[PDB]
Design an enzyme around this catalytic site. Structure first.
Site, PDB file in Angstrom:
ATOM      1  N   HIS A 111      -8.558  11.035   5.148  1.00 16.58           N
ATOM      2  CA  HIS A 111      -7.391  10.264   4.721  1.00 16.58           C
ATOM      3  C   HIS A 111      -7.386   8.780   5.107  1.00 16.58           C
ATOM      4  CE1 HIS A 111      -3.422   9.691   3.145  1.00 16.58           C
ATOM      5  NE2 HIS A 111      -2.985   9.244   4.307  1.00 16.58           N
ATOM      6  N   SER A 137      -2.056   5.665   0.639  1.00 19.17           N
ATOM      7  CA  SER A 137      -1.119   6.688   1.036  1.00 19.17           C
ATOM      8  C   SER A 137       0.275   6.434   0.528  1.00 19.17           C
ATOM      9  CB  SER A 137      -1.203   6.991   2.517  1.00 19.17           C
ATOM     10  OG  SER A 137      -0.630   8.269   2.714  1.00 19.17           O
ATOM     11  N   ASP A 187      -7.624  15.776   1.755  1.00 17.24           N
ATOM     12  CA  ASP A 187      -8.316  14.778   2.559  1.00 17.24           C
ATOM     13  C   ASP A 187      -8.028  14.832   4.058  1.00 17.24           C
ATOM     14  OD1 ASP A 187      -5.756  13.667   2.810  1.00 17.24           O
ATOM     15  OD2 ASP A 187      -6.255  11.795   1.707  1.00 17.24           O
TER      16      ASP A 187
END
Ligand SMILES: *[C@@H]1O[C@H](CO)[C@@H](O)[C@H](O)[C@H]1NC(C)=O
Ligand SMILES: *[C@@H]1O[C@H](CO)[C@@H](O)[C@H](O)[C@H]1NC(C)=O
Ligand SMILES: *[C@@H]1O[C@H](CO)[C@@H](O)[C@H](O)[C@H]1NC(C)=O
Ligand SMILES: *[C@@H]1O[C@H](CO)[C@@H](O)[C@H](O)[C@H]1NC(C)=O
Length: 376
Positions: free
Chosen positions: A356, A162, A324
């Site tokens: 995610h 991320s 996601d």
């Protein structure tokens, strides 16, 4: 097998604090502690009422004159476990079942013959800030990479999740090509929000407690606004058209050309200053200059835009696109644009149905990583 450095995302590692405060917001808040305590993730600090104490300690204070953040008076914050993995494996040190983040992946790495703190190391950071206020971190990261190269006899594989991908890109953009060719083997990018994410608008406007449902969205909004990293991840114009509407109300629309008005209208003018401070930090067009493996989730409904009947203090209706669950598909595809600016390969891997956070513990993700590290 090559040495590995793990880089977490937002909320993605433990944080510790020590207090000697001149004042508190309630009498029940502690003024002074004799040592450091875990401020993230510690569930006891997040109960109603007590949460006001937590917010007062974990917020950053924005100074408009210096265009820089500072901690509240008498509050100090430390990032534990640099060069180790414990603080990104588990967010809550009291507790396995809650906060489990890189743990499953590190268990796999260790099963493949890695050793924590030696040829696999974490690079945790103060994720409330953007890269412009984490200079020392990047110096330490450079040094740690060089040490691992020397100790384990080859270049390092960076694995980031991320927002950690944007931290890593910032770092790589600032290292000479000769340095990267010597010290970096490859960069494995998991769930990277290269272009920002749409849900940042909802976070800033009305708060997002989806993770922390026992806490009110208006309470957690105070923390989320105070974090520079939140405004840094607003949608960018290299991914989105300036005519895309992200927030609609009965009387006004907001596109990414309307951020100044948006911040005025939500009552958070500092956010605009933070966005100006941070919007240029990662150059849209500068490639990393290393072999890049870009893994992104698809097929999961992902907030794309918001309709507010009453703005900004009532929850919106959500319109969903692809991605996601958090990172919009469009923002994740940014990596392919770098292929024509760099000679090193850029390899894309779609992960259909992969959420995610869950992508870090997903069998298919781990099988891909195994192939990168251990070979055919
Ligand atoms: C805000 O920044 C300016 C310039 O750095 C300074 O005069 C002022 O003291 C700062 N605020 C603080 C330290 O609280
Ligand atoms: C906002 O944009 C949508 C289409 O993108 C349009 O239907 C709506 O009329 C617009 N509202 C205003 C106030 O401009
Ligand atoms: C794109 O947005 C940036 C801010 O990130 C701004 O400087 C610029 O004016 C925009 N337009 C173009 C053509 O890049
Ligand atoms: C793991 O990822 C795969 C393929 O990318 C996906 O099909 C699967 O749904 C994911 N696992 C879970 C539990 O969602």
């Amino acid at each position: 097998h090559p040495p590995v450095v793990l880089v977490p995302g937002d909320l993605g590692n433990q944080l510790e604090a020590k207090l000697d405060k001149p004042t508190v917001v309630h009498y029940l808040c502690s003024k002074k502690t004799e040592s450091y305590f875990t401020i993230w993730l510690n569930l006891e600090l997040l109960l109603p009422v007590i949460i006001d104490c937590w917010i007062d300690n974990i917020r950053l204070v924005y100074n408009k004159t210096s265009r820089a953040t500072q901690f509240p008076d008498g509050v100090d914050v430390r990032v534990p476990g640099f060069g180790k993995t414990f603080s990104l494996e588990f967010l809550d040190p009291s507790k396995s079942s809650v906060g489990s983040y890189f743990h499953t992946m590190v268990e796999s790495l260790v099963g493949w013959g890695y050793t924590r703190g030696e040829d696999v190391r974490g690079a945790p950071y103060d994720w409330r800030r953007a890269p412009n206020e984490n200079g020392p971190y990047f110096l330490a990261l450079r040094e740690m990479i060089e040490e691992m190269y020397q100790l384990y006899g080859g270049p390092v594989v960076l694995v980031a999740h991320s927002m950690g991908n944007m931290y890593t890109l910032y770092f790589l953009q600032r290292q000479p090509q000769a340095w990267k060719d010597k010290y970096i083997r490859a960069f494995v990018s998991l769930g990277a929000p290269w272009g920002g994410v749409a849900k940042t608008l909802r976070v800033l406007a009305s708060g997002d407690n989806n993770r922390i449902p026992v806490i009110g969205p208006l309470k957690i909004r105070e923390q989320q606004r105070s974090a520079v990293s939140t405004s840094w991840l607003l949608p960018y114009n290299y991914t989105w058209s300036p005519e895309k509407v992200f927030v609609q109300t009965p009387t006004i629309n907001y596109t990414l050309r309307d951020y100044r008005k948006f911040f005025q209208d939500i009552g958070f003018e500092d956010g605009w200053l933070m966005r100006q401070d941070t919007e240029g930090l990662v150059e849209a067009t500068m490639p990393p200059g290393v072999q890049l493996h870009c893994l992104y989730g698809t097929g999961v409904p992902t907030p794309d835009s918001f309709y507010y009947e009453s703005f900004p203090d009532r929850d919106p209706k959500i319109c969903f696109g692809d991605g996601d669950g958090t990172v919009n598909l469009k923002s994740a595809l940014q990596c392919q644009a770098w292929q024509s600016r760099q000679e090193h390969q850029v390899l894309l891997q779609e992960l259909p149905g992969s959420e995610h956070i869950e992508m870090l513990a997903n069998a298919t993700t781990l099988a891909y990583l195994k192939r990168v590290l251990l070979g055919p």
